[model samples]
Target: PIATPYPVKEWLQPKRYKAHLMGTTYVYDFPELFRQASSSQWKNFSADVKLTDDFFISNELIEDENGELTEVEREPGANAIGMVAFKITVKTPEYPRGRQFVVVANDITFKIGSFGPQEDEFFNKVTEYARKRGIPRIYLAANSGARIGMAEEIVPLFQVAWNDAANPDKGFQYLYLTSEGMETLKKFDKENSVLTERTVINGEERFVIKTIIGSEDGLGVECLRGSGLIAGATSRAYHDIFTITLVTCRSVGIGAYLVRLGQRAIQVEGQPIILTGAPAINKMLGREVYTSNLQLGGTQIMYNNGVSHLTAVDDLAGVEKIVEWMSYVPAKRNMPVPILETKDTWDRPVDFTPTNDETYDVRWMIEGRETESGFEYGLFDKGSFFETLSGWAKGVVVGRARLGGIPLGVIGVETRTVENLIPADPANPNSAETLIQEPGQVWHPNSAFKTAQAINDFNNGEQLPMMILANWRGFSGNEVLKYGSFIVDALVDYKQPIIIYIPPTGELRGGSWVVVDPTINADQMEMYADVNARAGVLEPQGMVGIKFRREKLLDTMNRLELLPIYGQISLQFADLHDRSSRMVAKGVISKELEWTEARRFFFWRLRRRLNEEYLIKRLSHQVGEASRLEKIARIRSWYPASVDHEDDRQVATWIEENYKTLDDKLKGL
Candidate 1:
């Protein structure tokens, strides 16, 4: 019989704790980390060699921060100097030669995985190596925090100044070092380094000490400087290349900062990522309230706050995810993203379209199949959709998916009622104050923020071009402008192609349409409308009520005999203005697409643009500065007048040929 803290049923018990060797085996130990990394079944697993470049070496490791490492006492392998960097070369089925990237993993077995001067310095160098090679950087963060060593030399010899000298245990005002201690410390200062204060206590001279002046390397502020260095490097790496961090276990202090600075982060279940561990926080608060590290920065907090972009079961799952994310990324920055040809066909028809007055699962529309029972067909390849930030915003969906085997960052609009759980007050944890969230048609504060973040993350981090299934009904209008403004800026500042498609039976009106209009960044963005799409400044009924009132209708028609028909006609006219044809006719959208042709249309569309854009970049660089016109003209002239760019296949096929002859450039396309 086992001890039970509460009267609980078989299924309703608190999690029991025990050793997790096989589980955290890879995270805590570097050898197994490499073994699991190289032996994972999911990855292509081509080739990788351990990186042992000790750019700057450190002394032997110590678990407690009380002593110097060179004192002929400290220990072994998982040195408080806690990290290993590796360059893994991998190939997908699509690209055999594959690509290489740097992986930096923290060794928790070493000094409980503390980040010290040498540790942070090594991580900084490793990140720079990744950036220098134009490859991605993945950080496996599992650490206690920055090393905070004490003045071991001064601790044992210090004397306490007591208020009542007779009763030594009664009270202590301050600590001081005796002249003999000063003599001992003088030898330390002359031989190595230390910090101390000199003054007279009572009649005799005393070396008073207020704080343990960190006397050893990696013993205090020096560690802070190293943390700062690594932090700066991680941020620069985030902006320059694809960077993602995974919290394989508890990541504290600078470990948490490292995860955040890397941008995209994955959290292992039951793990915590906190600035300060729970025990320290409780000590600071003078309360024994929080129970464990998870209570502070677990997946419950980080994932929902959008701090942890994804969550995994354990280290193995986490490592597999790094590769999964790379599936969409290119080997190098600014290069074409990896595209894997799938068994799925390019010419499949979209089988799911929302019915009138009916809410639909957008994923079904995206995946081309119903969960319960229905026909099988979707816009993107089957099972190719990978969503992130799903734990936070339930309305606007964001992730990478393949369309005709081309990787695209897809933003789909949810049409059902969303139920959002707002955790009760921190002071009132047990109180149930949950509120069912609003329907997804209207963009709320959280959804809008999520949308803005998704677009930018896709543009910069994932480097995948976008496809936003626009169906939002404007803001309930961050608390809308805060996150709303970011969306506008994100779209305007986009570098890759963005295709905004109004899905079948979708509507884009009011402020949603205003922010999403392709006119804002016409070169990178284009607005498309489904044959059943609706686009307008406002809804048709509202438009009719305001502008096409009965009075106006009667004044215009003046056919009082047929006045009965004119009211209905006024509403019809208003509705007609919102249709896809009207939108296309008025230059509001690039073109109207039929539901069946959506799959093939976007595939060739994305393929052609990806190909064409690559040419523009390469030729621009090859011909060098002032070749702006020359680059475009030469590109445009490559295809003959007989073959229009409008024919996607002709352009895509021609560009893949990879060379433009002098005669070809001379002729007008």
Candidate 2:
């Protein structure tokens, strides 16, 4: 029997593709892409490479050349468009032993790389299996959408009944299949995938078609079940293990939903993610104004909306990016994050200077930069800082970085005003839009949203200890204020320890201070400040206005007998009280640290905190707050920072000497 028609769209033919495709150099071959996504060593390792979409029943390209049309497995099969899929288990640079994951990539050459019932079911099972085994789930989404087909036998002979045969363009009463058409369809009478009605028009008897006689495998409703199946599995897999979708081609309909549901997604530069294609949307809008699907959901739209975390110029780059992201996270859920050794020393002071006079880019403060003489220094591993959702939320930067080989989630503040452009209304040509420029060191709507999102993402599956470069003044135009509330809740709920550092030139005031206070999550949280960090409910200049009225200023300084005549109001009077010393004296901060010493302090602090936490989880009873506090105190005492102006490395060396005793003794205790 002949199978369904496979019409290859002319535009998809070789020599028919646009120049941009080859120019961008997107990798389309499955195994080839796998090579770049993993590494060259993958080809010569004990890693298991499993084929996922192997079909047994039949397919268009398979056959046996025998006299009797060859033998074939005739049972339900050969329906899927996913002719090529892979289940590869491999090792990344960070996971030398191995980290297994499932990859479901759509071959763009086959049927526009669409999803049929079999394809969706295959994807669902793969995701479910990965989730059950506690492995990562990856999908390379590139498709036109759900399959649409209809019964072709009756369409060739069906007759349309017109109101006036002389003027058929006026209207059509109904469609009817002649007796000959019915007879032609009887060859497959055993299957009734669609039905029709028998009715008489005029004196002659006729079989009026009641509904569409769609093909057995098409009709989309049945295909929609497959969409729902994979979507549910992908969503569940995300909560259970790592799930990411990379859009290397146009992802329409179910493809878009899959990306959105998976939560973490990367997009190739020109690719778009949308439910309906732009041509159809334009038609629905009764205009030809909308052009490319890229205009609707491309990087400019999705990345700016924070729907896509990263963008690559092409496919190989995207896959490589995925590997880089996986390095910071664990291979599976509830596992310790992967850490790498760094060449940079941990005890040295960071090279970047945080000047109080003017604002500077915080990237240098986190990732460091090269000097003309070639010296490099920063708070983290020199090249390990990878920013996520970077196109959005310019006021705050979120990324994963390594500090002294320890993987940590970093939230750095951008200390310059950000200008966000608003598009003008097209309906009114003269109607103009305004640009929203948010000042630095203040949390606004989008930046707060990004902060909340980053924290949850880091806490959920990445499971890395957090380092918040504290500086924001408070929620601006105070959704942002309430968003701060969510951030507080997130911090309070964090299981890993967090060290919030206020930079030398930074300040945290009022609402900002409340949300990040160690008191909120005392066990998992701590605050460190530089001596020059200026923090208060209000700036000293502003505080003096209300607290030191003219009469009061005279009353207080009258003992000196002349202070009212003081120029500049001696606003410096209250400045001393607002410094880090006061914060320490009032017990508001854990310690006063200098900007130059942050790198060493954080490394030791992180190691000490992580060690204590491990002990706390193992030996301390989780039931009572009293026991928790007692255990925490004991752990802190056991792992003490160096005393006085002494080098931190001295204490670290001492700890290394007695670390085993400390561990074993604590366990026994």
Candidate 3:
């Protein structure tokens, strides 16, 4: 199966074939693989090595006879093309462990190592033998994918014998040691174990083929699921089995998926682990890229993006790091998993009760307590709430945050804290929905839609929970409805669970019904209000006036104003208080509590419960019908912000600035 000494003169001679320098150095006197010339110039190079007992060195060569190559074989299995199986033994420093050294290399040197029936059979037989004997199989891949001559038969067999169903549990286990090898490893995973792990296997998780490249297609293969096979294997390993990748050379094409599949990936500084080679991809995309190999290497891309788990300046360093990482990961399925002790506990308690009245702001609560570190990726424009338009409607706040140490969406309302007018845009009618015109009291429709959309995406990704503070009296009058149709349709599209809270004077009404009313279609959604919050349409005075003058005195005067006036403006201003509490009493709001209690309840509930809609709707509820529109208007006008669009915007801007300051404080903490 393997030669202990060189069998032929041409076999050990220089540059005839490119060798994987895993851990051994073989002398080559020619310059075929590399373009340089010099004896011992390739001395320090290494290849990838693994733990196993079956490894062999070939001493066969092809001689150029009369301008044509002549083939010769020195051993029985030495010249077998596409023959995937062989057995050899190597000695190691560790006594009993020395018996575990395995070496398996594809015979690409013999015939380009293309896949065929015999080769496939060899691979199957060898793998079965290893499984039966309870031994690990080490595969050295160097072939040029499937052989053209054997395509017809090999393709069907690969699709059948090695098909996801047939080899559901027999897929390849990969350990990539170089970014250069990532693509090859990933492709193997995708083609062999993709669907099998997902559907065919019972609790049969996918294996991981660690690599610098993110995907196997990043390698050269156009259709095989190599990445799937590797990832499936890694995923199946409970603890005893581990996989790794090395970016030793060029790992382009489908290889990029390899990094994502593996629990960890190691990249060599000089090696390039890209989805496609610069020239090839550039040609495909009609562009020029990467001026040199250094420009295309792993550190330039993988390291910058934190895509590679580990990086090595050289091939040896990469291999060493890979070995270290594997020591922590399991190597086989059903093995005891390992746990590490660290200070980063994701479930830390948040103390928001005292801070609620202290003016610390919810942003501070999130930044200081919710995230592992106060650091956040800056994405929101500071002090820009009023810049969002809509001086009247209230229901949403959209922004970004870090969740579980990763980037995520953050949405919350300050309740009567934001007010900005919508500005008409001649350039884009849709723009009119997003911008403010009057700078003080314009209505905005798209702002609500954008907020809803952000939360919806965040929820769908299950990235982070959304927070809301209920304080709106309702939507603007008919003068604002001319913008777009988003008022109703967009609100319906919000599928995420929103946590809403209210202050003593917070209220809900009008278009605000959908925002705060638990009985709206969003009744199953989460809602909360303060004990003193009040809500309803039109105050008692307005209701009295409307009910008393039902016919509008039409029998005599055509004018509509029939009610007696008594400081109409001042009376309307006073109605803003307690509107949220009213809605709570009417069963339109989900929960009611004191400011101190509500803050504590919110943080505690957020920690223990993840599915917000289920938790909120299932809690305590009050039953009552909505107040008449006339009475609700009285409550609406009473809202502090609703006094005028300018007042609302000023308040909203203050809240927005407060959140920014809160974030800054937490970040410093």
Candidate 4:
């Protein structure tokens, strides 16, 4: 009697009913997908991981035994089917004592893990706790953006129409309504609806329900506002404690912002991050432009664009990387980096030689060569280098590594050519086609931005010592400088120790000098140059262009007359200005050393500077309340011209006034 055969009837019936008639069976089910993915990730975590209460706020929708849609409240002990929050203790070589931090993961199972009010509330609380505890916060995001669901209770105002047949006094009649539906509608008409206008059109009287007092149309707006709050919270977390995100699946809309706003992100190989889905873009453009999400925000595109910090093979790999990055940073702010002893010798001879004419990897200086393709070892602790923001900016390398087993943040300049330059296409500005090779080895806008971001990241922690390997030709003074500001003011404002090393072939001139100038915050900064290093107010060509205009003018008059004079002045300038020896004599450079002893020099300098900082911190803590007050007064007197001293001066005046009064009272008694 059925449409299919005997045994197949049951199978066909459900398939037809679920897939065709009921419209429930689709290509993929998001809830189940998220559940499986999150469960696998949860199981892989170490036993020390502790789940927070916010992780249990569920998003489960149920179908009752009677085959009707209904809402089922999840019990208190039940896991939050859509979100997961936990804390774990991580052990690594850098932090052998083990570091504790928090993790918040989005469960893809319920509502595609699309965040709503409840999820946002949970996230805000989790970040709040992380900030209070001063611990790193990691977010495992695999979401389809914000949830968009209809509150059916507000659907009737538009779908239901009223006329004179249903009510005698109000002349209201329900259009396409059953008796039960009319009763529900009548309650809305009396309590919530407002009739603001009565208009007659074409001789027919009409009543317009201008507004509904309790309409829930602003659900989407609320979700967007919630997203803005989340972004603000994430930024605060970045400043207060370290924050990182791992994008494991299709993260879209607000979810994309959440991943990027963290500034530290690792993306899985196949996953994509999009502001909007391809289908939506297709609908808006009225064309079938692309088929897959990968075209928009895959690992390649994200890394090239600098949206993600790194890429992982899969979810487990991404988690492992998070643990590795965390190990370099402290468990909290105001703590010194963990100093671990390593096998690499501190006085190991530098393995690579510097050259002027050809480009070589800067890593050769940080990590010397052992074989043609391998390294003897890094200048830092063996296997301790962890690079961040590796994809976006090729010219400036930023990362955390240890020198003589002491953790430090490093920023190195790359002298090699950049081959992957994607030029904008004239035919389609929004095209997804990947751009191939081009040539470059200068600071562009992207590289500048990444450098600034790295500096800011280091400053936020305010503990790690910083070092820069200076070997830049200079800033590209084209559109790049215009689009990206050439100045990094944070370098000048840095409160901790910063060391700049100029290799033999390195040259600093014009804009480059402005960045690594030894005079900025001289107390906290130190500069060193190799014996063969060259530096000037400008490069030779630039100096000639600015200072020898008369010589250039003379060349037009007589080539013979100009040649000898120009050559004489050029030699004189080089003798007086262009040598590293001159820099050392002028006190612009603190020391001049050979590249062979560079590792030992840096090790001793970092060790001494860290100890100095520790002693200063300890002394400050040991000072008594009266000594602190006296020191505050002394500092105010020292900076008398500073506007900031007005408050201290006033407080000092008040204290003196009270002291005199107390002395007078005691004498009179």
Please list the C-alpha lDDT of all candidates, in the order they appear: 0.75, 0.73, 0.38, 0.64
Task: Tell me each candidate's TM-score.
Answer: 0.84, 0.80, 0.30, 0.72
- Count of clashing residue pairs in every prediction: 3, 0, 125, 10
User: Candidate 3's residue-wise lDDT over 1-669, tens digit each?
Assistant: 257564654345322333333221111211111112111111212123443323212222232344222234343333444433333222222121222212223454444444444444444444434344433333333333343331221122222223355566876433212232323436555333222222233533333332222222222232243433433443332112233344444444334444444323566666555654566655765645445644654464565434554466654454344333222222222222112222333333333332224432334333432336544311121211111111223334444433232222455444323434433443343655354232211124544544444444333312234455444544443334533344344334444344555544445545554543344435324677766665556444555365435353344344555434433533454465435555555665555767544434553454333322222222212223433333334323433563342242343334344545534433453
Q: What is candidate 2's TM-score against the reference?
A: 0.80
- lDDT by residue (tens digit), candidate 2, 1-669: 134376432234442143134332222344456655565334322256542332111111211343111123332223235523344556555676766666666655457667888677667766766677787777888877887776765567778889899998999988877776667667667225346677776756677877765547755688889888888887777667887888887788888998888878899998888888777876776767576777788898899888999999887888878877877888887777786765776778889877878668888888897789875588888887989999888889999999888899999888988887765653355878779888888888888788878887788667789989889876666577677778888887787888898888889887777878889888788899888887889777677887877776665564433654552465787677779999999998988988887888888878766655666775554435557777766655665454321343554455557767777865564
Tens digits of per-residue lDDT for model 1, 1-669: 368786433223211111143135343233344335444522333236332323112222222353321112222232335776656555444455656776787776667778988888788877887788788888888788899867677677778888889998898888887789778777777323344578885678876775565467788889999999999999888778889988886788999998888878899998889898777777877767688778779899899878898998877787767767777878888778778766777887877777768867888778766556756778899878888888887878888888877887888888888887876755444776578666777888788888888887787756889999999876784377788888898888788989999988889989988878898887789889999888788887788889887788877885446866776787788888889998877888889998778888889988998877776776654534645556767778867788786888778877776455533543333
lDDT of 3 at 233: 41
Best by lDDT: 1
Query: Alpha carbon lDDT of residue 591, candidate 3?
Result: 59
For model 4, where is the 10-residue window of minimal lDDT? 19-28
What ranking of all candidate models by TM-score puts the best one first? 1, 2, 4, 3
For 1-669, candidate 4 gives per-residue lDDT tens digits of 455545553243342233223212111222233333333433443345553433222233323465332335543223443555665554444454555666776656456668776677667777777788787877877777877655455466343343543675665433232334434657666434232344444544444445544334325767777778788999888878888898877677878998877878999888898889888877876767667878778887897788888998866667667766765677687777767566676778666776877777777667565676866664666666788888877878888888877777888877777666574542365765465432343566666777777777776753577888776666663656653443346676575688888877777666666666767757578899888877776666666667766655475455344567666666566546778788778888888878877877788777756544543444454345545345434433433364443243343344344544533433453
Ranking by lDDT: 1, 2, 4, 3
Can you tell me which runs of candidate 1 are displaced by over 4 Å? 1-23, 27-80, 161-175, 188-204, 209-212, 283-288, 370-375, 429-431, 553-570, 622-630, 658-669
Worst 10 residues of 2 by lDDT: 54-63
| Clash-forming residue pairs, model 2 | none
- Stretches off by above 4 angstroms in model 2 are 1-28, 37-80, 83-85, 149-154, 157-186, 196-213, 374-376, 423-428, 431-434, 554-570, 616-669
Displacement of the residue 615 alpha carbon in candidate 2, Å:
4.0
What value of lDDT does candidate 3 attain over all alpha carbons?
0.38
